[PDB]
Symmetry: D2
């Protein structure tokens, strides 16, 4: 029998990553409050999650990785997000970054992992950096904002633009060691506080050519690492859908938790002004129902989208324009529904739900934060998909 | 690779029912306009659909039936609805009625089908009839509204209440031959005109005990036909989810077609006033995108819900309270989203789209009609699901 | 003097207000509604009743025997009227608001139309499809001119077209032409507002003299041939467009307030077909009636405020600035949008019986949606218009 | 005299309207907003500025030196104020509206409060949690009384509780008590409207004499001990509740209008972080700015019309009937809902940077949502209130 309201446990001989997550969820949940005030992932959380080996979800097998299918991984993040959004978000990123690193030169991966198999990377992909072409590579300078989990990373992946002959943009990534940059703690946010999305500062950082890949190359299986893992079900696939797979996941995790948390607080709710017993009043019930439907519908769409990714990966098959448009955008619609579903409940939650000591207020905030990311902006997404459906050239103004 | 915007063709060897539908879809589509003025399904359409054997979708195998899985059938109705909603709707009902007949006595099924293997039944399940208990059965009298396809049926299934010693409602159905009732043609509607939902008139109709089953019995596998088909993947299952499976189906069919129809008419559109080519303007695109997303999300939820029906059927497993609530209501949420998606497009359609000679106007009407059936009313559904989620006793005021 | 949230308040005038006069004839209009739908135009009775109370002279200059009603007072008669037959209200509103435009043409033209017959009115078709040849003394116009509400009951038609400069740039103009110069082609088969008789005008080598031709821009800025003719008037020193298009939102509002009333009446006694239960007062129904009431009351407030602004401007002989003009162009579109939300919220709890031919809701629902399909009520266009203005951007010549 | 859609119109009444006086001090209020949020109450400066212009005497009777402002004029001050610091506006609104209620108590009580100190104000906690013993001459009340906006700046508190009939039915009453009779407990750690200082009052064996106790029903129907005291006043012959709860929607509107302005400012120069192109004027953004503008203008129209209704009623010393009362109870709830939709439509295009502590939007978004979480602004309850009334049903004693 299927389950509509949450992740179904892959019954497998040998216990699943998702069960392993489920056992440690109470601890995560209890640190949630002190994680918010810490403005990063508490050391305990990292240690627990790494202990179950989650961070090696997308690490190639040759280095001791699991190579989880997207669905299985997504669902761990969703489940995780239910307990601490910021943790789930940050940790998702640390994880999905290995899937990218896996497309770089064999030499780079060897450098990172043969040395330390538990090493991970945070990122800052927005190309703010000023780049000088020296011989052998580049020198990069810049302030690189928004690096979730950067405190717990040994490397960072960093985005920038290079130019060819007709000084055209060549969008590239560089992997750099933790010693090459300072973490500046300017992370004072109002949602997903626990993700530690501090900013990386880069001063005359040299990056050799072998730690630099073209984005386009990693979208189309032409990067230096292509063909390295001929048996893998997850590497013969565009880098971006994976890396960005966390946002919607976290968002959905929040939504499903909101429903549960709202239901718990709803049962016993009294009317301040009259004293009457009001937890089972029809309006409340209808909201719980509709939000349940809405996130169930969102989970269906994400589940179907993830299956699509998995199937493609299995078959070592790069998607076409249309499927690519859908993979870029369905997640944004999912995120959008999930927020509608959180809002519908928060709106019936009453004043007490906005107190610091109430969980709803944090879920509500975090939920909204998931729709503020560049990759989840639905205005941009509607235009992307739309243009594709009418068979129009893409707008280079968005991506 | 998965498909977001429509039914995926089950790549069997040989001809799937769905391909067979797809080949006849142009003809159905061309009769659509004269079907609307006919106020019932044109004889051609019935003949074409019966020829491909679709009406035997849920007929037991022993009488020459196919015993299609719910998903496979649902998807034929969705596809069909894209060409003529009223046809798809009416015909869906004529089909899903066999699934119910199949739970009646062996004697009844023998009576209907050994005699004529192509016979089908229309229905009127709202218990308006006055019922006298005579010995050996009942005499029923009543005007029975809303019998989709009743012009093309050889039997009608007809709902009524019988009473205990306690004098409590026992909701029952009776199958009655076409000779036992007059079709009154009072079907003047403003949507799904082609369904021929005329009203059955019953005057002192006698119904023998063997043509009468309790609804509750068919919900719980206790009706006279339980056990008859020990190998069947579709009869060990409550009757209602199958019978009502066509509404959301039709509704989805209509939505997917709107998006196609809108896109076609959109390309070349000029502003009436300023005379400007305007088919590719950003707002239109964004509506095409989001309606696309919306119905895709609906399709995902229905596809997931149907899988759940299929799985249960396979395992001869009757669902529990919770899954039952979800099966009762997810369809209603799907219908709701589908109508939102139609409305979002009809609203950018401009005045020309409301002309009799435009398809959009019919799709828009028919789409709305699908949310007006008793089983798809979302207000009632949210209350049903809601009460279940909070662990409340059901409200006998709705069902 | 308590305010009223759910409908037009009756102006205590001297003598009998136009709105009371409408209110007395509303039953008759309402009883013809069903046969008007099958007639595909306004029934002769309705025209005769409405003209008898003098409504068609709502915007006719006083010198010819007109009333010169303020926008709010007129709008509110349409809203009320629309409650009984949307198509009648819509058609008739147009026949009415056309005089306000005629009043900006040459004194000679007005004299021609009204000194001859004071009850004469005009239908229109303003979308510039016509092919236009510049002959000397005026133009020859040819074209099929769609969508002329009330055109069966009109003696003239106002017709839109483009002329060109030296430099070949569009000069959007209107011409008033007699009923004898065109054929009404009956291609009006619609699924909403059937009774408006929006048939299409056919024009074959119609000659139009220069004096029956005004520039749209001139009528927007008080520069047309009729500017200054009525120095005491509270309604002519004002751009033509806001008035002419004032009817759409009005009708749309009329339909919404009526839906609420109609839904309430049918709701009381409603049963579930399935359970047998008397279900008219169930909390979900109540909440929908409430929220639809709030939503249309909120639309009414925005329209009433917008109308006041038109009135105030007209009083002061003051042409609005860019910002107010943007608001006048678009507030009505938002109102129309809310009204349709309000109708939908109710039709969605209406059940299957409400979609029958013999039910009023089905008509109101259809009509309500038709009011948001007009080119002037399209909200996507309006959001862009108002948006550009608020950010201080040049207007998009792509829409208007 | 041209109307304004996007904000309060300045009442031209020459000399300085209260609203102008507000507008001059708004920059200061705005600059303290950030440190007010961390203070979790209204900064002493803000109180001092606002009291200096005399705003707190908005509803104080004239005999004590009050202004007796009309509801519209006051409401609009709160709206304007809320644009700069919601929590200030909210708290101060309450301190203000409480005088309107005090004005219905015995002449002796008002004399006690104001003849002594004419600047004295009261905070409240109206939810009847208190346990109440009937002693002779009055009551002894005990309880923890949550949510007392501005309670740090008040000299008295108004406190709600239930007493009982012969056959012991709830008699809902209010008691005014001096600041010495209760402790302020600082448990106010919220995530919205932080600056309102809505701390909780603790009451230990507080004695309340009969003359500082009024029945709520009496103050709803002009039967309280202070009825008739100000025979010339335009604002006291009116149920107490619509005035006291007038601030919430007002604040909520204030925040919305400010969101639009704030969003517009930040939108202009917004690049993509991803591609590299002036993204501030993209069509989606424009349309959201447009539609939110329309939505809050429509909300403003409904509140403005509702306020006028209160004003007209007050003028005429006329207590409203069931229907208008249902509307006054609920329109504000709809207004608040629209305002939050409008805020959300913008916050959703605002991008990640808008959720930083150093961004104003994030605070506006939070505060905006908080206004819809009060017991009087809950729309579910409101739809059921209005709905039942419209269908002519007895009220549900389960909500109020
Ligand atoms: C109910 C209906 C009646 C109309 N009546 C008139 C009319 O009498 N005169 C006129 O110029 N346009 C009329 N219009 C047409 C519009 O002005 C405009 O040309 C049309 O809405 C263009 O929309 P489109 O993009 O669907 O073609 C009417 C439109 C509809 C909605
Ligand atoms: C398009 C249309 C077709 C219908 N066809 C049938 C049918 O054939 N058999 C049936 O028992 N009920 C049919 N129903 C009626 C519903 O089962 C139910 O009686 C009706 O929705 C009651 O809704 P109401 O509250 O408006 O009466 C149909 C309803 C509509 C929407
Ligand atoms: C921002 C905030 C401030 C409030 N300030 C007051 C106040 O000063 N006086 C008062 O009686 N109630 C105040 N209320 C509390 C409400 O009157 C009511 O008791 C509370 O909203 C009950 O809602 P609940 O169901 O969440 O408990 C306030 C509520 C919130 C939203
Ligand atoms: C919660 C939060 C965490 C983020 N974490 C990262 C990250 O770790 N790496 C990264 O490259 N971008 C991250 N982003 C930033 C986005 O990729 C992007 O630069 C940002 O959303 C731009 O949006 P804006 O238009 O508001 O500037 C994050 C954004 C938010 C919503």
């Amino acid at each position: 029998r299927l389950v509509y309201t949450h992740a179904q446990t892959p019954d497998v001989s040998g216990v699943s990553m998702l069960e392993k997550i489920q056992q440690i969820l109470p601890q995560i949940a209890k640190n949630a409050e002190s994680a918010e005030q810490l403005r990063r992932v508490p050391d305990e959380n990292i240690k627990l999650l790494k202990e179950i080996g989650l961070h090696r979800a997308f690490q190639p097998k040759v280095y001791g990785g699991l190579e989880m299918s997207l669905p299985d991984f997504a669902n761990c993040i969703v489940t995780l997000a239910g307990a601490c959004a910021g943790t789930a978000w940050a940790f998702s990123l640390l994880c999905t970054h290995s899937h990218q690193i896996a497309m770089f030169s064999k030499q780079l991966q060897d450098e990172i992992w043969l040395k330390d198999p538990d090493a991970t990377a945070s990122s800052s992909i927005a190309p703010f950096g000023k780049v000088e072409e020296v011989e052998g590579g580049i020198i990069l300078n810049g302030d690189y904002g928004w690096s979730s989990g950067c405190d717990h990373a040994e490397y960072a992946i960093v985005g920038f633009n290079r130019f060819d002959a007709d000084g055209n943009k060549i969008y590239s990534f560089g992997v750099i060691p933790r010693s090459d940059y300072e973490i500046v703690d300017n992370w004072y946010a109002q949602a997903i506080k626990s993700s530690g999305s501090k900013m990386l500062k880069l001063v005359n950082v040299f990056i050799p050519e072998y730690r630099i890949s073209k984005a386009k190359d990693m979208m189309e299986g032409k990067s230096a690492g292509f063909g390295l893992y001929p048996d893998s079900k997850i590497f013969y696939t565009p880098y971006r859908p994976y890396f960005a797979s966390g946002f919607s996941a976290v968002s959905l995790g929040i939504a499903e938790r909101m429903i549960e948390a709202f239901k718990e607080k709803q049962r016993n709710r009294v009317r301040a002004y009259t004293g009457a017993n009001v937890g089972l009043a029809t309006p409340a019930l209808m909201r719980i129902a509709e939000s349940t439907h809405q996130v169930a519908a969102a989970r269906a769409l994400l589940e179907k989208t993830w299956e699509d990714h998995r199937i493609h990966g299995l078959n070592h098959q790069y998607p076409n324009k249309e499927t690519l448009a859908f993979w870029r955008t369905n997640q944004a619609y999912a995120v959008k529904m999930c927020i509608e579903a959180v809002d519908r409940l928060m709106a019936a939650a009453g004043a007490t739900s906005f107190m610091d000591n109430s969980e709803l207020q944090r879920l509500f905030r975090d939920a909204h934060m998931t729709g503020a990311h560049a990759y989840t902006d639905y205005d941009v997404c509607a235009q992307i998909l739309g243009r594709e459906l009418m068979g129009m050239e893409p707008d280079p103004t968005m991506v």
